[PDB]
Structure 1
Amino acid sequence: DAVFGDRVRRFQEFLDTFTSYRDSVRSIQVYNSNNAANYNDDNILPHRIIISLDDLREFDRSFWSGILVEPAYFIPPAEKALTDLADSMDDVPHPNASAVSSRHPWKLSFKGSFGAHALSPRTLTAQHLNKLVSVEGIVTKTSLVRPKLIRSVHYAAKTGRFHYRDYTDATTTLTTRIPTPAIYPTEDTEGNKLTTEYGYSTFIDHQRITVQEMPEMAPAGQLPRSIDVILDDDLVDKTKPGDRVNVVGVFKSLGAGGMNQSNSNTLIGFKTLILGNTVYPLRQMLTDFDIRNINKLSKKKDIFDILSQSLAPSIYGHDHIKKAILLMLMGGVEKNLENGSHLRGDINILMVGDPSTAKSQLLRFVLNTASLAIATTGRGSSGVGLTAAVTTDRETGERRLEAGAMVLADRGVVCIDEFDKMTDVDRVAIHEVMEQQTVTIAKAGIHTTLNARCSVIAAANPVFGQYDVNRDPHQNIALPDSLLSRFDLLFVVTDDINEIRDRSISEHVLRTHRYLPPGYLEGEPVRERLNLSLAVGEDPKLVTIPFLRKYVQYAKERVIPQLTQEAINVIVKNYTDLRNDDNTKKSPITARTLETLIRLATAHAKVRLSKTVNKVDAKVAANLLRFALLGED
């Protein structure tokens, strides 16, 4: 009534006080308008802006406090004012055939500092209901996208006029209203037959996601907790399972909560939900300074050595394995070939070695430094847990598929630990993914082929406790030959007792164990708790890790080298020399070694930020594979 109009006036004043929002409205409007005029087209921007809570805090403390504390009485007044401003801006007429019926009202999004309203799915209780909150977590489950009716239009014969009926739901609006039965009117007020006219009605896409707490922040002895978020309109399909997200929305109650005709019970409570306003991913955009630095650092001669050594500075030695990991990070170029085939561009590495040889501390580093990485353990995994699982969608009722570890890491890496301890029934599935890079599901009436293009790095142990040099290589490794053929580089690492090596490595380890984080006193235990302050503002030389991430991203997305003849000449001579020799290698040499040389050469070419494969790339690939197969170093 009066309060609604007063708040509309307040927000209207706020809008012309700061001119940025008015300019963004015009930019979106002109973009959408002149896009439709391009008949010879080469797509549509949604009606949603992002305002900062901070600026509103200086403008009007009362309105900011109302939005943060009582959103359900201050957001709808703001949306009407934004719609009015947007309607005022659009001077050009749009006599469209059916856009007159559906207005697509403008909505709002928020950013800035939330103070005490930044929480997690665990610290959210009944004290935060009907409040604007932001929750950080990991997406686990998503529902199928369905259309929902918002307004129905009917045509009346013998009169020629139209009649519309509006529908509302608890999840649709922020205010509780009288419910609607969602049944189309059939009789006019005068009794004339009504015909439903699809194409003038309004439907909106609806989705439900589940956000779980980060497992690293959970208390001792407790399992992580999860919450449900509802997305609508233009927020649909902006998240996938496994993603790390931050969702800003209104925490809301729903239902009757067992205080009704049903029997009295202590086990019945209310249901809680979040109507998300905004979603933020917790792709690093690069400026011209960063790109210029990358191009300047590319021209240095010893760039490969620096890049490889920058990996895991807390590991002493293992230079060649660290080079192989870097070559994994910058994968090869995939070739699509006739007969529906593709040559894989991924590099797969296996490490077999003695106990306590820093095999498992490199997989953990790859988990952190890479863009996408999935961790797996041999004994705690199953075949149905790696490829896909048949489940049900509670909200709609169909039967669907849920992704597994391999398919969730498409265009990523999978790090498997204790690979030899995996059961045989489990080990067949990974075989297919390593060969075809596709999963075939033919269960419960769901016949589908799923794409899985991932790089595999694995660590295992020999049959006995330690590697034996007096026995043949195949006796030492329990893995079958078919599985072993699918790895590009097999590294056998051994711990040998030598006084100088021990003196150096012990010094390095003792130096590492004496590190104090900044801002901590001696003897002060590390407080890895953050004190519930999740965030302050809601949205020889070595190189730093973020710079390496930028370098890897830029190389993967900007250069695609092509093979040359003079590199092929080196590759063929290396292959012919390696094949025809009496040296006893730890792995047999076959016709698939040539493809490994090609892939390593392509990766080294990408490292140099060049569009051609040179002779030096072939030499580096040859040296790496000679070290891997022979140990001639």
Structure 2
Amino acid sequence: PNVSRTIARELKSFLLEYTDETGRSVYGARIRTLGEMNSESLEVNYRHLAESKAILALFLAKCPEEMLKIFDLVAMEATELHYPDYARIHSEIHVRISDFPTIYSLRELRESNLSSLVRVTGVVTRRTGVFPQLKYVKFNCLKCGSILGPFFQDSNEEIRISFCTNCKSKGPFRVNGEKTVYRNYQRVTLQEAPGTVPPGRLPRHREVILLADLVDVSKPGEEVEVTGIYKNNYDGNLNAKNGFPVFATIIEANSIKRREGNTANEGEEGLDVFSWTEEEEREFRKISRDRGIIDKIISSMAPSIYGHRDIKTAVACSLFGGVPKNVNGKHSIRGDINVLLLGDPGTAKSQILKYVEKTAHRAVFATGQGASAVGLTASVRKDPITKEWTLEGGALVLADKGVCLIDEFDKMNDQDRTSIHEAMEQQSISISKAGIVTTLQARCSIIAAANPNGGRYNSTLPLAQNVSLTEPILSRFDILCVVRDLVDEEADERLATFVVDSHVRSQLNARQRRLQRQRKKEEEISPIPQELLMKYIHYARTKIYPKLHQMDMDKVSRVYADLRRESISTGSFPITVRHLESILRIAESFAKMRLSEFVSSYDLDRAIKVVVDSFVDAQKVSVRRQLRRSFAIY
């Protein structure tokens, strides 16, 4: 009709005039920023969605798609005044919608859900590639007007006719080749992921048709959840069942996001914002120019566990990473740091690895028995009935920062461990079992959760007598964190009076008052809360690259030489050329957290005095004699 013309005026006012939380023009700021990157996307805030649905709940759940088409043309004028002539490049914008207060699984769909907004999860199975789609059907007659304008083709219906507005004959419609742009099209089919499902039963299938600027965001195998509309296509033809009065199912999408973790939130950590625009990046410099940050961050990293310090020094250093420094036409350099824990059965070693899975950006948790010798790395899945032997990788190609638990699965230890210790040595390993000779590139990180045969001091003798893992695979790591706990009172209460208080941690204002309740529940002693500390690791890793100097080097020369000399005559397990490579590597890991690109003098001896003590403190009864050498380093 015509009142929808005023609707565009009625919301450009209602959106752009004010953004919540003490103004600041939040939505008025993220428009120009995604204009700067030239990436064709927008967001809508849920609380704004809660306020922009009061007159629009009967224009969202009643009519979801043609409301959006008139919603699309106002966003041009919402930025045409801001960025002039932006329509001369790519001429197009379309919006995306954020989270929604529904929890629908795949099973719970009925007739009442159709032609409306839907939200569902699952996992991505077998997928196709990228094709172009015509998207503007310039129809063509033969003798009359052979240009009927660029049409608007639908989904799988093949919208055409025989004759209209030219004649009434059976002259068919053809094509020609002037100025028909193309969007792309990628039909991921979806399988229900076996998470929240009453088990012991089958998976269920759907289909998903993606759209133009949302191609190949997902990878095969990874868990996703999709927010879009529901649609129908009564094709009147199906050939698995008989032909019947039925109709198929097509879910078109408007947005897509990654796997989420710890699904217990109320207003955050479900939407991947990760968009450090104004209130963050202007703030995040003064948090970097303080003097005890590296003595503050690693203390405040894993808040639930009081323990010995040196593991939290190491495990924070692991996900901070180094640099894959390339070189000229010669051998490449490993840019990874691979810790290995060793713990008594009952200390907190299974939790720090569990907690770091959330605080990373991407992860995997292949643990224990059932880890296949091939299923970690890439494998070839055989063809379906008319296809070719294709390559479908598993764990390690997906995970860039993955977490395994190689403790002592001894029956399969002689199977898989010939396929993980060349992910480090001959890094970027791939294989050609009965297929194609290729080489995928996976700069993955490895942590571990080793476990001795019983107690921690199962012998006085060296670690070859302690662990069943032999020498050379063990030497592909950098450091050996080992724990100790015999008998204490005041150190025992320091855990005991600590852990008892952790169990004691069991509407617009009230939504934020619960959010203010979320502040004080983690700020008893106030150790620098995790509302934002994970929010800058993602550009602590993809924006800053460090370098070194030369005047601060040759102190380490006698360190490698004498300690290798001191441990060959006393041979427990050796050090090689790669330990010193790890020495400078974790040195520049700390300096990346100053956001600084340099290397000081304070960081080297810091990084020295976390490796030299953590090597010597597992030797023998004669660790006491080695500690008489120790303060010469300091």
Q: TM-score range by the shorter chain?
A: 0.7 to 0.9
In the alignment, the residues of structure 1 paired with residue 203 and residue 297 of structure 2 have an alpha-carbon distance, to the nearest angstrom, of 37
Tell me which residue corresponds to 2:186. 207
Tell me which residue corresponds to 1:414. 403
Q: TM-score, normalised by structure 2?
A: 0.73
In the alignment, the residues of structure 2 paired with residue 601 and residue 625 of structure 1 have an alpha-carbon distance, to the nearest angstrom, of 11
In the alignment, the residues of structure 2 paired with residue 80 and residue 603 of structure 1 have an alpha-carbon distance, to the nearest angstrom, of 50
In the alignment, the residues of structure 2 paired with residue 278 and residue 68 of structure 1 have an alpha-carbon distance, to the nearest angstrom, of 17
Runs (5+) with no aligned partner, structure 1:
1-5, 36-42, 182-188, 517-539
Q: Quick check: 2:150–2:180 contact (8 Å CA) kept in 1?
A: no
Out of 209, 213, 216, the position equivalent to 1:237 is: 216
49-58 vs 346-355, which deviates more? 49-58
What's the CA shift for 1:69? 2.9
In the alignment, the residues of structure 2 paired with residue 273 and residue 393 of structure 1 have an alpha-carbon distance, to the nearest angstrom, of 26
Out of 526, 537, 558, the position equivalent to 1:573 is: 558
Deviations 1:281-338 (A, max 9, x none): 5362235554455433334333222211112222232310110011112211221123
Q: How many percent identity over aligned positions? A: 35
In the alignment, the residues of structure 2 paired with residue 270 and residue 212 of structure 1 have an alpha-carbon distance, to the nearest angstrom, of 20
Change (3 A) 1:262 1:487: closer
Tell me which residue corresponds to 2:377. 387
Q: Does 1:17 align with 2:10?
A: yes
What's the CA shift for 1:590? 1.5
Q: What one-letter code is carried by the residue in structure 2 that aligns with 1:230?
A: I
**Matches for 1:121-200 after TM superposition, within 5 Å:** 121-136=106-121, 142-150=127-135, 162=146, 171-172=155-156, 197-198=176-177, 200=179
> SS in structure 2 opposite 1:577?
helix
Tell me which residue corresponds to 1:524. none
14-23 vs 470-479, which deviates more? 14-23
Change (3 A) 1:510 1:234: closer
Q: Does 1:596 align with 2:549?
A: no
Q: Quick check: 2:137–2:153 contact (8 Å CA) kept in 1?
A: no
Tell me which residue corresponds to 2:166. none
Tell me which residue corresponds to 2:531. 546
Q: Quick check: 1:49–1:107 contact (8 Å CA) kept in 2?
A: no
Q: What one-letter code is carried by the residue in structure 2 that aligns with 1:14?
A: I
**Matches for 1:158-307 after TM superposition, within 5 Å:** 162=146, 171-172=155-156, 197-198=176-177, 200-201=179-180, 203-210=182-189, 217-218=196-197, 227-241=206-220, 245-254=224-233, 263=242, 271-280=248-257, 282=271, 284-291=274-281, 293-307=283-297
What's the CA shift for 1:68? 1.3
In the alignment, the residues of structure 1 paired with residue 139 and residue 246 of structure 2 have an alpha-carbon distance, to the nearest angstrom, of 40
Deviations 1:485-505 (A, max 9, x none): 110112233442344444433
Tell me which residue corresponds to 2:312. 322
Higher helix proportion, which one?
Answer: 1
Q: Quick check: 1:82–1:106 contact (8 Å CA) kept in 2?
A: no
What's the CA shift for 1:511? 3.2
Change (3 A) 1:76 1:557: closer
Q: Quick check: 1:560–1:611 contact (8 Å CA) kept in 2?
A: yes
Q: Quick check: 1:129–1:252 contact (8 Å CA) kept in 2?
A: yes
Q: Give the RMSD, CA atoms, in angstroms.
A: 4.8
Q: Quick check: 1:561–1:610 contact (8 Å CA) kept in 2?
A: yes
Q: Quick check: 1:406–1:414 contact (8 Å CA) kept in 2?
A: no
Change (3 A) 1:555 1:475: same
Larger relative contact order (Cα-Cα within 8 Å, sequence gap ≥ 6): 1
Q: Does 1:629 align with 2:615?
A: yes
Q: Quick check: 1:374–1:413 contact (8 Å CA) kept in 2?
A: yes
> SS in structure 2 opposite 1:486?
coil
In the alignment, the residues of structure 1 paired with residue 213 and residue 279 of structure 2 have an alpha-carbon distance, to the nearest angstrom, of 34
In the alignment, the residues of structure 2 paired with residue 261 and residue 326 of structure 1 have an alpha-carbon distance, to the nearest angstrom, of 54
Q: Quick check: 2:43–2:98 contact (8 Å CA) kept in 1?
A: no
Deviations 1:471-517 (A, max 9, x none): 3321222223221111011223344234444443333333333432x
Change (3 A) 1:502 1:340: same
> SS in structure 2 opposite 1:272?
coil
Change (3 A) 1:107 1:501: closer
> SS in structure 1 opposite 2:119?
strand
Runs (5+) with no aligned partner, structure 2:
18-28, 163-168, 259-270, 507-524, 618-626
Deviations 1:317-374 (A, max 9, x none): 2310110011112211221123353211211011223212222111101111112221
In the alignment, the residues of structure 2 paired with residue 374 and residue 205 of structure 1 have an alpha-carbon distance, to the nearest angstrom, of 31
Pairs aligned (count)? 563
What's the CA shift for 1:457? 0.6
540-549 vs 146-155, which deviates more? 146-155
Change (3 A) 1:190 1:376: closer
Higher strand proportion, which one?
Answer: 1
In the alignment, the residues of structure 1 paired with residue 144 and residue 573 of structure 2 have an alpha-carbon distance, to the nearest angstrom, of 83
Q: What one-letter code is carried by the residue in structure 1 that aligns with 2:155?
A: T
Q: What one-letter code is carried by the residue in structure 2 that aligns with 1:480?
A: T
What's the CA shift for 1:53? 5.9
In the alignment, the residues of structure 2 paired with residue 197 and residue 340 of structure 1 have an alpha-carbon distance, to the nearest angstrom, of 52
In the alignment, the residues of structure 1 paired with residue 237 and residue 140 of structure 2 have an alpha-carbon distance, to the nearest angstrom, of 42
